Amino acid sequence: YEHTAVMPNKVGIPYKALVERPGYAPVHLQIQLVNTRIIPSTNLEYITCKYKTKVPSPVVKCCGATQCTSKPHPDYQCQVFSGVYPFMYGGAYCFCDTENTQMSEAYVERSEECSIDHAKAYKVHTGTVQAMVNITYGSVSWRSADVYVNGETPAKIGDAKLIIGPLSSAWSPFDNKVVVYGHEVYNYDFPEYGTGKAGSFGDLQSRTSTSNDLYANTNLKLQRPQAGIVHTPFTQVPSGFERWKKDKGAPLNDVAPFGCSIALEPLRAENCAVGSIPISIDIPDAAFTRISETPTVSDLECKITECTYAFDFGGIATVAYKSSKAGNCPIHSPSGVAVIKENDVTLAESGSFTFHFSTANIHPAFKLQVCTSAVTCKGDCKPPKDHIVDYAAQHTESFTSAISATAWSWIKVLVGGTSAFIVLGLIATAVVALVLFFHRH
Amino acid sequence: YEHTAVMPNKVGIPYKALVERPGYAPVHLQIQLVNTRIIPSTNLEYITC
Numbered sequence: 001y002e003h004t005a006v007m008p009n010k011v012g013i014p015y016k017a018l019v020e021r022p023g024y025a026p027v028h029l030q031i032q033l034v035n036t037r038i039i040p041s042t043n044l045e046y047i048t049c050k051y052k053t054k055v056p057s058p059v060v061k062c063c064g065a066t067q068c069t070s071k072p073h074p075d076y077q078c079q080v081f082s083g084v085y086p087f088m089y090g091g092a093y094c095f096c097d098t099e100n101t102q103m104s105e106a107y108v109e110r111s112e113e114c115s116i117d118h119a120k121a122y123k124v125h126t127g128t129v130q131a132m133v134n135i136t137y138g139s140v141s142w143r144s145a146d147v148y149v150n151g152e153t154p155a156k157i158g159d160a161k162l163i164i165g166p167l168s169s170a171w172s173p174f175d176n177k178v179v180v181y182g183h184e185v186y187n188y189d190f191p192e193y194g195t196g197k198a199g200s201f202g203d204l205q206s207r208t209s210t211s212n213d214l215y216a217n218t219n220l221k222l223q224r225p226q227a228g229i230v231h232t233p234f235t236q237v238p239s240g241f242e243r244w245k246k247d248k249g250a251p252l253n254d255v256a257p258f259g260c261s262i263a264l265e266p267l268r269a270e271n272c273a274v275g276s277i278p279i280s281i282d283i284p285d286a287a288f289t290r291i292s293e294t295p296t297v298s299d300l301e302c303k304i305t306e307c308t309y310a311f312d313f314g315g316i317a318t319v320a321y322k323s324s325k326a327g328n329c330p331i332h333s334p335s336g337v338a339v340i341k342e343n344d345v346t347l348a349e350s351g352s353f354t355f356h357f358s359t360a361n362i363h364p365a366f367k368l369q370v371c372t373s374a375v376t377c378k379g380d381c382k383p384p385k386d387h388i389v390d391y392a393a394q395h396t397e398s399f400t401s402a403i404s405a406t407a408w409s410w411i412k413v414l415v416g417g418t419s420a421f422i423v424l425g426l427i428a429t430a431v432v433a434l435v436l437f438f439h440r441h
Numbered sequence: 442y443e444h445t446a447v448m449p450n451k452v453g454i455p456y457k458a459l460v461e462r463p464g465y466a467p468v469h470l471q472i473q474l475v476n477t478r479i480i481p482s483t484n485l486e487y488i489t490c
């Protein structure tokens with residue numbers, strides 16, 4: 001039997017319902033999400049890391065001159081400094097005082113740290129949404145499986161065929177561009193490959209961490225060597241990767257809405273409490289029992305003995321009953337007013353049973369379904385003591401949940417007073433108009 | 442669970458109350474004063490004899 005419904009996209013809060021099959025006693029169904037994962041499709045754009053400046057030995061040409069040539073090296077620089085007179089431990093290196101030339105070379109390459117300390121720039125698009133579900137039905141204990149939240153791929157869980165519909169919202173915490181550094185994800189609009197600027201995040205860009213083609217854009221300028229010293233001085237803008245690491249700011253892990261948790265393998269947002277999830281589960285036929293084969297429950301009376309509209313199961317109720325065959329009986333509240341903790345109870349020939357529930361309503365009024373029967377529970381609830389709790393609420397608050405009987409009385413008095421007073425004016429007008437008409441006639 | 446109340450300043454007369462904690466059965470509480478002492482601060486001015 002196929003049961004179709006919509007459950008909220010809340011991890012850790014179970015969805016409870018009764019599977020009502022004509023001719024068979026209702027079968028209690030419970031579906032709980034273990035986790036929800038939004039797995040976008042990612043494409044690695046390039047890898048950024050701190051640059052290393054490689055400086056080959058300068059060519060010191062005594063009594064002559066040399067000329068620089070271009071080379072296929074990232075940010076390659078070459079400048080010929082004429083009129084050098086270098087000295088070393090062995091004295092004057094060259095004889096000629098002026099016809100003396102030093103050729104300096106420098107180029108940028110990936111630092112050794114780039115193998116471990118680097119940022120990955122990813123292009124992010126929409127993708128698969130997956131979830132893990134925990135399901136029970138009838139006497140069958142908990143079963144779980146990983147399913148695709150797409151509304152097309154069925155999953156076999158405990159011989160039950162479950163279809164999970166697409167999320168009601170396409171919202172995702174990742175922008176079209178993300179930067180993955182370590183365990184953190186940043187919604188950073190990184191510059192495109194080949195357009196990075198010196199001192200900024202993209203100053204050094206590589207398609208892969210092992211790529212032989214490196215793009216480097218730093219103001220690498222060769223400076224004239226100091227008088228008499230053989231060295232290759234240079235000026236360069238500080239690495240933009242270190243600057244970004246200082247200014248990277250708050251990662252998406254800390255600012256993602258809806259409490260999403262960000263994971264990197266694969267990149268995904270977990271447990272985002274967004275929208276609702278349509279579902280469809282086919283309960284095995286063997287799980288259903290005929291009405292005449294189940295105990296019949298009658299003479300139901302529900303008394304709420306305690307109630308607090310706390311996030312936990314702060315309510316307690318006692319249900320008196322009479323039943324035949326003294327068997328087990330599913331318990332469920334189809335109304336959203338209160339969520340019942342117990343799923344089923346053991347019934348005797350006569351007696352009473354208790355159950356716990358959580359509700360936000362100051363005056364709960366909900367229908368409790370007892371296998372083949374139903375009863376209405378009413379009561380009053382006190383405010384909770386704890387201002388702050390470390391656990392999510394088990395119930396859903398409604399617009400009218402906070403309206404007390406006193407507030408309803410005042411609302412009825414105000415609305416009825418104004419309505420009746422206006423109606424009085426209208427009736428008086430019609431009556432006097434008719435009186436004038438009969439004055440003429 | 443904190444229970445707050447006002448008891449009379451009487452010695453030998455116990456204060457009785459039920460500590461009602463939401464969701465738990467009430468716990469009987471009995472507070473009795475054995476003695477009360479007002480101990481002012483004193484400065485010896487002088488000794489006469």
Ligand SMILES: *[C@@H]1O[C@H](CO)[C@@H](O)[C@H](O)[C@H]1NC(C)=O
Pocket residue numbers: 034134142143144
């Ligand atoms: C399903 O819920 C039951 C509750 O007793 C728990 O023992 C089980 O571990 C849950 N399933 C998963 C996959 O965590």
